Symmetry: D2
Subunit: 122 residues, 4 copies
Amino acid sequence: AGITGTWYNQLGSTFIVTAGADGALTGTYESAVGNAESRYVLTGRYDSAPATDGSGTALGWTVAWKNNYRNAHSATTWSGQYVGGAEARINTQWLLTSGTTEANAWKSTLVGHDTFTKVKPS
Amino acid sequence: EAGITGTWYNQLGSTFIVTAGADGALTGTYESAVGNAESRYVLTGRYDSAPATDGSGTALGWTVAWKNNYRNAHSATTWSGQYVGGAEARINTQWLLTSGTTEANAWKSTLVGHDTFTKVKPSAAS
Amino acid sequence: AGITGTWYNQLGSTFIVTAGADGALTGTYESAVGNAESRYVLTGRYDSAPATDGSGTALGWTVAWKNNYRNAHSATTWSGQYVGGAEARINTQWLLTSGTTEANAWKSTLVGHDTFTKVKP
Amino acid sequence: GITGTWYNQLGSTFIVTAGADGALTGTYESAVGNAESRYVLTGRYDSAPATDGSGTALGWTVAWKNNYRNAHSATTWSGQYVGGAEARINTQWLLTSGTTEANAWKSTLVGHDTFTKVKPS
């Protein structure tokens, strides 16, 4: 249980995160897809005192797709909630914005949804 | 210079003050136009510290969890966008606000919208 | 000829759609299974000449949540693609906008995703 | 208030009719006005909005196929009409292109368009 740990999305991306007592999320992200190689830094925030009514724990984080190996001139933000359960999950929506010219800004942003569990897909 | 460090104001009464670190981090505060402590929240994010040189903007994103020492909305916003430099500098974003919900209410967990931030807002002498 | 017929999400909704040869989607969306006061018009468009390269068929539709019985003063649009074959799906992301005052416009629009199947759960 | 010709911030031209029944029908085209740029739309709106100052919820779809071109994609706009002095339609949109399921993660763009009855600027 809990947010700190190693998680995988439905495509096998690897999300290694630590939830700090201060509400911080820190760790690394390794993408199964896209113009990405090896680990990237992530940082985010989570609600360190969630409701006690059965609701999930809100949270979000960012990866800018620049590391010491590659730069895709883009950033993904995941917004979602951790859900304790038989099999813990983090359910997210995300936005990926690329740097664009103004003329291309209308097509700057992809949207999708990732669900993370502590088990990796095959 | 990345052009990002400093104070920015969205179209609706919000402020944030951010530092863009040489290591690609965004760190700072997000608050109301009023600027009372109870309206202030931590943020953290990332930006591309080596943007393209073709006139494209600089990709970035950040998160605020809407809990501080005073209040807790059990929610978090992420802003994903790009900084556009020049005479009309902007940070153009789209955002996702997720609230903690039960599973039965998960369908209504996430709001979407857009924010444009600028370096100036209307201000007047007293 | 893949899309026409009955589709089911996880949440107890069902819709019936006709995919017309001119790109029209027309039908009825039932939000709750045993409830004839929960049926709403749906209307949209799809790519009537999709690729046959393994790609999905792009589509979208709208339901305004008003019928003769109920009115939520809101509308959902689903944007997605139909994936055919033996285990066909319509994979969507959606936007639900409610009418609001200007002061509340920042909180007017929910976003989410949903997957429909041909096989009644 | 919805029936008419509307323009978004990039000059695209949205020629819509709002029918008695909640129906939206019309065309969507570029500022250039050429036939190859013009596409069919259909959608829905709340035909009985609240009377508390709230906007009128609506949505529509364009599949990006016409007699001339096919992009194997569709946009849905979800939003609300705000009447009064200067009428406006404020929207969020999703553009889905056909992909494989595996690349499905890059199928959908998101943005926002605001429409007025005047050309932008």
